[PDB]
């Protein structure tokens, strides 16, 4: 396949769109400064915000969130810098001292696989001083997201998880952590070809921006060809995290300096990292520079094109440039330690290093110039072609550049055309460019193999779309051809070694492309063998991992010949432009090295320059040229007319009369051939909506050469069936048969919405190439007759539907129109000249029946600000359909009194060609004035076409969360924990019930929720014929309810929902201080419960443990929403997150999604069964609903469902402790293995929590945080359930120690009165921190050898959990906080021996820090205590007091000496004891 051409008016480049960056700075560490007061400043481009001030902390904590929003182009967003700085003593009076700064850019943060860095530590270096060392690190999370992106957020963990600096640096892949300094020389030499800005002179100077620094050269006053010869040096951290250098020529002025042009050097194209890579280098070579139009205007609206914001519409300058980096040793005292940008004199380079200036030649032939836009074509028009400054005759051999102006004639009401016919104007341009053709040839072979590969991937994507047989063989052939072209590029590009015009970048880029493309060829040859159908899609992605990087090869940073520009001018006022690259036009002998646009006629769509080329002004095209272009050496000009169609005869200018090889000013064609286009137009689907009713009036105009016709208008449909051909009679073309069959001409098809007057709104356009046939060839299969194909219409950037067409070009023969095929006349003869699509091309139709289950309608909005009372649904498929029964009142019952009804239509035989079914709800008000409430049409029927087939419950939560963590890590009692929406694993519970998303309004462009006017609930069943009896008995049991038998009841039923909110983690902070105060809000219908009375305070990871009961009247009250809210002391409360969980499909699924089913039964304790019915009654109800025999019972260990038997345990315990027999365990096992039923077998949800991502309307597609919750449904017409689960969040302990004596404590104090050494020994110890566990003993004054006597008892009461061995407490973070915050640490004790004084603080002598779970055992005597029991010797075992409960021993306390080791500075005899809270009151 892939006969369609891919042309788009709006590419990805140029269009500005909304981005935002979110930067949070969690904790700063390892900073430097004496009594410093840090503030973290975050800068993105031209703005910056500061955090709060912290006083005298070395490790401050901020956790402050910043969001920067911009609406800019993607390329200029990727060039914005990100600066994280730390400032000491910032104030407005005096500038604070800079501690450290870190530079980064937006574009490489976007280059992450998650478009973000999670928990990464910025290296806060010193940009102000190269010789200075590291100034600290700052942990941060930085994310870049624009509109239209869906991303997954990783675990936003606290300090209790991995937070180490070195393994989580703020680096991309492959960057070395030390980031050695470098000098970046750019060497601006010369320039040529400047325009006029004084009216007419210019005062240029080159300013270069990189990494937030800038440097400008001197100004060469009054010179259009200036010579700067100056070099600008930067210094930054190699490798540069910023990936672009903005070099910009500027015209200096005394009031407002403006821009000449701007070129962006992408540093990835000129560099390679690693030990096999090479340092950044470029040039000395010429760089082309494009911008706005060269003629001066005082109010130029295209000024931003000179700044690089968009696409250059004309050539503006050529700049000689060089670049070279070097790594400098910053420890050398020979060089100054400065950092700022410097401008010095550069070394002059000869022109022979960039290639000799040499004369090139451009030839162009304007064959066709049609579809000129009407609002400009009242004047005669021209076509000015300029390459470089050559051909700029308007602004200022004799080269010609313009076609002769002559008036445009009428084609239709929307476009003119130009009557060239046989007189084709031509242009010839002499030019002088350097001899760097080999660079363009290498980039051209790169682009040629990349174009072949991209054509292969688009072809196999089309065979994926149309389900053609074995695309894996096409993939293997594509990879083999890619390897063959790879070896061709290996054997081709290396033969021009002898020239000395190669720069420093040429050899390095050729070698790097050699190595990388050898790796690509061997990787493609290895990937060819593993291509398989069932894993084809990932293989496609691997091919994309080739192709884009191949384009990364093809982009040349040192382009020699500038792009050619083809313009339009009406009375010498510029209208529209096209810009063709010159690597595609260069002529050469080898076919892969030959340009893809050289010596062939190509279609070329002009467009408005700059900002007028975007949006609604850029809908209609400005011209559709059929241009022949050739570019190359004048000694290679021997065959620059060979690719042209034959039959032409030259006419030259006055200077070239009688010459041999003078290029012609014009051509006259004599070999005219007549043709006819049969524009087959069968259908369209999913078109754009251009009326306020949500539908349109589509009629399509077909444009071919100069003729244009329109198919008839159909009314109030987005999927029309015109059933019409457009006969363009007696076309004329010029050429021969072999130059036209493989390259047919272009047909452009636009669709318009007819309105109440003569104007018509726009739908977009598509393009086509007709099936071409000659007189000598016959109408043989499989080429003829042409089959209808799908043509993708694009309304600019956004897609706007498909189109059904079978275009064919047919030449007339020597017998005239008698050699034309027999035209099938109109069966409906009332249409007259409207001739339908003939047979063979028209899809052969067959009888189909559509049976529609009309279940209900949900949340329809107002029509003309009036409420909807009595809906009805019309259904249209292939023009005919059935209408639903009326409902009586929407507010009390939004359901139809009968459900199943059918209709008979004709549909095509193959399912790929099916027209879309269109449902339309309309209000049936009085007096027959029915208006459109909603419409849903875009659907494929393939899914509907039938074919015959001490423990608590938290311990159970821990025993499941660790298993799901183990399974997640191995991929990269117990409940089945689900990590996402339950709908994603259980296909939104759409077994028979389907939700069709119901639309009214114009289709959105550059949301669907604003178009939402409700949704339809129901099902479709479309089938050809009644099948044999065993298959058709599904409908044969009850024709009243049709094929949808097995349906459950439709009448309203009363229900309670029981929502359990377990916990939540990774909350986005509602408050700006990185904290939140969460509480659950729940809404369902009229019910809204907000539990503000039982909030959790100062928590981003709430342990909730809450259960709520909500009344609901189904089917109206089936739209539950669960949200988390933040308490605010003043003002209004701010929402944190909100999730939607609908209950219609959950209740009415076969999967039993009302309540989960546990792993096993227990009638007491932590595994209590919350559902009121036993599982025996549960599968009794499921067997009665699903037409299943069973359940059957025998002994208590077996249960029979259908023809299968399952097993399980027999006895079960209650709270009294005595066993009882039951068979409900085996019933629950049958519920677990319910998938094995041969007819009604599907999956069932187990008892779960779901980790639903909470979304926000402000950030679509972005998870603010994950919420652990699960819902239960219990219909109240069955008996009510009991007490809900005790999921409420949580043992208290007493640690007591006694210090008996001390020995060998170091005598720190010399005696003031007698002189001997002594020590006032006393003890101190604490578990948690300062304000809670600080206690000390009495002082043993004046020790002689370290002996002391205390006999003092400590006591530490606390809370504790043994699941993670964590001591549990909540305390205020600061004295200014409102209330307490929860903290977790492991079991710690810190013991110290001090030296008391009567007048000041005590002197530190010794310390130990031990764990109650793994401390080494104590000595038996004081003298047995040695150094080995405290250090890291493995010979000393460990004792846990949680199993021992009594420890007596001697233990050494260790000073903090300067030798980084431990020294015996004291011994302590200690008794250590553990009690509970109840035992502590009497022990
Ligand atoms: Ca309209
Ligand atoms: Ca209309
Ligand atoms: Ca708040
Ligand atoms: Ca708050
Ligand atoms: Ca003392």
JSON list of N, CA, C and O in Angstrom, two decimals, residues 1243-1267:
[
{"chain": "A", "resi": 1243, "resn": "UNK", "atom": "N", "xyz": [-13.35, -13.51, 34.30]},
{"chain": "A", "resi": 1243, "resn": "UNK", "atom": "CA", "xyz": [-12.61, -13.19, 35.51]},
{"chain": "A", "resi": 1243, "resn": "UNK", "atom": "C", "xyz": [-13.54, -12.62, 36.57]},
{"chain": "A", "resi": 1243, "resn": "UNK", "atom": "O", "xyz": [-14.65, -12.16, 36.29]},
{"chain": "A", "resi": 1244, "resn": "UNK", "atom": "N", "xyz": [-13.08, -12.66, 37.82]},
{"chain": "A", "resi": 1244, "resn": "UNK", "atom": "CA", "xyz": [-13.80, -12.07, 38.95]},
{"chain": "A", "resi": 1244, "resn": "UNK", "atom": "C", "xyz": [-12.82, -11.25, 39.77]},
{"chain": "A", "resi": 1244, "resn": "UNK", "atom": "O", "xyz": [-11.66, -11.66, 39.94]},
{"chain": "A", "resi": 1245, "resn": "UNK", "atom": "N", "xyz": [-13.26, -10.11, 40.28]},
{"chain": "A", "resi": 1245, "resn": "UNK", "atom": "CA", "xyz": [-12.35, -9.30, 41.11]},
{"chain": "A", "resi": 1245, "resn": "UNK", "atom": "C", "xyz": [-12.22, -9.93, 42.49]},
{"chain": "A", "resi": 1245, "resn": "UNK", "atom": "O", "xyz": [-13.22, -10.38, 43.07]},
{"chain": "A", "resi": 1246, "resn": "UNK", "atom": "N", "xyz": [-11.00, -10.06, 43.03]},
{"chain": "A", "resi": 1246, "resn": "UNK", "atom": "CA", "xyz": [-10.86, -10.51, 44.42]},
{"chain": "A", "resi": 1246, "resn": "UNK", "atom": "C", "xyz": [-11.02, -9.36, 45.39]},
{"chain": "A", "resi": 1246, "resn": "UNK", "atom": "O", "xyz": [-11.28, -8.23, 44.98]},
{"chain": "A", "resi": 1247, "resn": "UNK", "atom": "N", "xyz": [-10.87, -9.63, 46.69]},
{"chain": "A", "resi": 1247, "resn": "UNK", "atom": "CA", "xyz": [-10.91, -8.60, 47.71]},
{"chain": "A", "resi": 1247, "resn": "UNK", "atom": "C", "xyz": [-9.62, -7.80, 47.62]},
{"chain": "A", "resi": 1247, "resn": "UNK", "atom": "O", "xyz": [-8.53, -8.37, 47.68]},
{"chain": "A", "resi": 1248, "resn": "UNK", "atom": "N", "xyz": [-9.76, -6.49, 47.46]},
{"chain": "A", "resi": 1248, "resn": "UNK", "atom": "CA", "xyz": [-8.62, -5.70, 47.04]},
{"chain": "A", "resi": 1248, "resn": "UNK", "atom": "C", "xyz": [-8.64, -4.35, 47.73]},
{"chain": "A", "resi": 1248, "resn": "UNK", "atom": "O", "xyz": [-9.63, -3.95, 48.35]},
{"chain": "A", "resi": 1249, "resn": "UNK", "atom": "N", "xyz": [-7.51, -3.66, 47.63]},
{"chain": "A", "resi": 1249, "resn": "UNK", "atom": "CA", "xyz": [-7.48, -2.20, 47.59]},
{"chain": "A", "resi": 1249, "resn": "UNK", "atom": "C", "xyz": [-7.02, -1.85, 46.18]},
{"chain": "A", "resi": 1249, "resn": "UNK", "atom": "O", "xyz": [-6.32, -2.63, 45.54]},
{"chain": "A", "resi": 1250, "resn": "UNK", "atom": "N", "xyz": [-7.50, -0.73, 45.67]},
{"chain": "A", "resi": 1250, "resn": "UNK", "atom": "CA", "xyz": [-6.97, -0.23, 44.41]},
{"chain": "A", "resi": 1250, "resn": "UNK", "atom": "C", "xyz": [-6.22, 1.07, 44.67]},
{"chain": "A", "resi": 1250, "resn": "UNK", "atom": "O", "xyz": [-6.62, 1.88, 45.53]},
{"chain": "A", "resi": 1251, "resn": "UNK", "atom": "N", "xyz": [-5.10, 1.22, 43.98]},
{"chain": "A", "resi": 1251, "resn": "UNK", "atom": "CA", "xyz": [-4.23, 2.38, 44.11]},
{"chain": "A", "resi": 1251, "resn": "UNK", "atom": "C", "xyz": [-4.56, 3.37, 42.99]},
{"chain": "A", "resi": 1251, "resn": "UNK", "atom": "O", "xyz": [-3.84, 3.54, 42.01]},
{"chain": "A", "resi": 1252, "resn": "UNK", "atom": "N", "xyz": [-5.71, 4.02, 43.17]},
{"chain": "A", "resi": 1252, "resn": "UNK", "atom": "CA", "xyz": [-6.24, 4.87, 42.13]},
{"chain": "A", "resi": 1252, "resn": "UNK", "atom": "C", "xyz": [-5.48, 6.20, 42.10]},
{"chain": "A", "resi": 1252, "resn": "UNK", "atom": "O", "xyz": [-5.31, 6.84, 43.15]},
{"chain": "A", "resi": 1253, "resn": "UNK", "atom": "N", "xyz": [-4.98, 6.62, 40.94]},
{"chain": "A", "resi": 1253, "resn": "UNK", "atom": "CA", "xyz": [-4.32, 7.93, 40.85]},
{"chain": "A", "resi": 1253, "resn": "UNK", "atom": "C", "xyz": [-5.36, 9.05, 40.88]},
{"chain": "A", "resi": 1253, "resn": "UNK", "atom": "O", "xyz": [-6.29, 9.07, 40.07]},
{"chain": "A", "resi": 1254, "resn": "UNK", "atom": "N", "xyz": [-5.19, 9.98, 41.82]},
{"chain": "A", "resi": 1254, "resn": "UNK", "atom": "CA", "xyz": [-6.09, 11.12, 41.93]},
{"chain": "A", "resi": 1254, "resn": "UNK", "atom": "C", "xyz": [-5.70, 12.16, 40.88]},
{"chain": "A", "resi": 1254, "resn": "UNK", "atom": "O", "xyz": [-4.53, 12.56, 40.81]},
{"chain": "A", "resi": 1255, "resn": "UNK", "atom": "N", "xyz": [-6.67, 12.58, 40.08]},
{"chain": "A", "resi": 1255, "resn": "UNK", "atom": "CA", "xyz": [-6.44, 13.54, 39.01]},
{"chain": "A", "resi": 1255, "resn": "UNK", "atom": "C", "xyz": [-6.99, 14.90, 39.40]},
{"chain": "A", "resi": 1255, "resn": "UNK", "atom": "O", "xyz": [-7.70, 15.05, 40.40]},
{"chain": "A", "resi": 1256, "resn": "UNK", "atom": "N", "xyz": [-6.64, 15.91, 38.61]},
{"chain": "A", "resi": 1256, "resn": "UNK", "atom": "CA", "xyz": [-7.16, 17.25, 38.80]},
{"chain": "A", "resi": 1256, "resn": "UNK", "atom": "C", "xyz": [-7.56, 17.83, 37.45]},
{"chain": "A", "resi": 1256, "resn": "UNK", "atom": "O", "xyz": [-6.94, 17.52, 36.43]},
{"chain": "A", "resi": 1257, "resn": "UNK", "atom": "N", "xyz": [-8.61, 18.66, 37.41]},
{"chain": "A", "resi": 1257, "resn": "UNK", "atom": "CA", "xyz": [-8.95, 19.36, 36.16]},
{"chain": "A", "resi": 1257, "resn": "UNK", "atom": "C", "xyz": [-7.90, 20.36, 35.71]},
{"chain": "A", "resi": 1257, "resn": "UNK", "atom": "O", "xyz": [-7.80, 20.64, 34.51]},
{"chain": "A", "resi": 1258, "resn": "UNK", "atom": "N", "xyz": [-7.10, 20.90, 36.63]},
{"chain": "A", "resi": 1258, "resn": "UNK", "atom": "CA", "xyz": [-6.05, 21.84, 36.28]},
{"chain": "A", "resi": 1258, "resn": "UNK", "atom": "C", "xyz": [-4.88, 21.17, 35.57]},
{"chain": "A", "resi": 1258, "resn": "UNK", "atom": "O", "xyz": [-4.21, 21.82, 34.75]},
{"chain": "A", "resi": 1259, "resn": "UNK", "atom": "N", "xyz": [-4.60, 19.91, 35.88]},
{"chain": "A", "resi": 1259, "resn": "UNK", "atom": "CA", "xyz": [-3.51, 19.16, 35.25]},
{"chain": "A", "resi": 1259, "resn": "UNK", "atom": "C", "xyz": [-4.04, 17.83, 34.71]},
{"chain": "A", "resi": 1259, "resn": "UNK", "atom": "O", "xyz": [-4.00, 16.80, 35.39]},
{"chain": "A", "resi": 1260, "resn": "UNK", "atom": "N", "xyz": [-4.58, 17.83, 33.48]},
{"chain": "A", "resi": 1260, "resn": "UNK", "atom": "CA", "xyz": [-5.01, 16.57, 32.87]},
{"chain": "A", "resi": 1260, "resn": "UNK", "atom": "C", "xyz": [-3.83, 15.66, 32.56]},
{"chain": "A", "resi": 1260, "resn": "UNK", "atom": "O", "xyz": [-2.75, 16.11, 32.18]},
{"chain": "A", "resi": 1261, "resn": "UNK", "atom": "N", "xyz": [-4.05, 14.36, 32.73]},
{"chain": "A", "resi": 1261, "resn": "UNK", "atom": "CA", "xyz": [-3.02, 13.37, 32.46]},
{"chain": "A", "resi": 1261, "resn": "UNK", "atom": "C", "xyz": [-1.87, 13.36, 33.43]},
{"chain": "A", "resi": 1261, "resn": "UNK", "atom": "O", "xyz": [-0.83, 12.76, 33.13]},
{"chain": "A", "resi": 1262, "resn": "UNK", "atom": "N", "xyz": [-2.01, 14.00, 34.59]},
{"chain": "A", "resi": 1262, "resn": "UNK", "atom": "CA", "xyz": [-0.94, 14.10, 35.58]},
{"chain": "A", "resi": 1262, "resn": "UNK", "atom": "C", "xyz": [-1.48, 13.63, 36.92]},
{"chain": "A", "resi": 1262, "resn": "UNK", "atom": "O", "xyz": [-2.50, 14.15, 37.41]},
{"chain": "A", "resi": 1263, "resn": "UNK", "atom": "N", "xyz": [-0.80, 12.66, 37.52]},
{"chain": "A", "resi": 1263, "resn": "UNK", "atom": "CA", "xyz": [-1.18, 12.10, 38.81]},
{"chain": "A", "resi": 1263, "resn": "UNK", "atom": "C", "xyz": [-0.61, 12.97, 39.92]},
{"chain": "A", "resi": 1263, "resn": "UNK", "atom": "O", "xyz": [0.62, 13.09, 40.05]},
{"chain": "A", "resi": 1264, "resn": "UNK", "atom": "N", "xyz": [-1.49, 13.58, 40.72]},
{"chain": "A", "resi": 1264, "resn": "UNK", "atom": "CA", "xyz": [-1.03, 14.33, 41.88]},
{"chain": "A", "resi": 1264, "resn": "UNK", "atom": "C", "xyz": [-0.60, 13.41, 43.01]},
{"chain": "A", "resi": 1264, "resn": "UNK", "atom": "O", "xyz": [0.21, 13.80, 43.86]},
{"chain": "A", "resi": 1265, "resn": "UNK", "atom": "N", "xyz": [-1.11, 12.18, 43.04]},
{"chain": "A", "resi": 1265, "resn": "UNK", "atom": "CA", "xyz": [-0.83, 11.25, 44.11]},
{"chain": "A", "resi": 1265, "resn": "UNK", "atom": "C", "xyz": [-1.75, 10.05, 44.06]},
{"chain": "A", "resi": 1265, "resn": "UNK", "atom": "O", "xyz": [-2.84, 10.11, 43.49]},
{"chain": "A", "resi": 1266, "resn": "UNK", "atom": "N", "xyz": [-1.32, 8.95, 44.68]},
{"chain": "A", "resi": 1266, "resn": "UNK", "atom": "CA", "xyz": [-2.06, 7.70, 44.64]},
{"chain": "A", "resi": 1266, "resn": "UNK", "atom": "C", "xyz": [-2.84, 7.48, 45.93]},
{"chain": "A", "resi": 1266, "resn": "UNK", "atom": "O", "xyz": [-2.34, 7.73, 47.03]},
{"chain": "A", "resi": 1267, "resn": "UNK", "atom": "N", "xyz": [-4.09, 7.03, 45.78]},
{"chain": "A", "resi": 1267, "resn": "UNK", "atom": "CA", "xyz": [-5.00, 6.82, 46.90]},
{"chain": "A", "resi": 1267, "resn": "UNK", "atom": "C", "xyz": [-5.38, 5.35, 46.95]},
{"chain": "A", "resi": 1267, "resn": "UNK", "atom": "O", "xyz": [-5.82, 4.78, 45.95]}
]
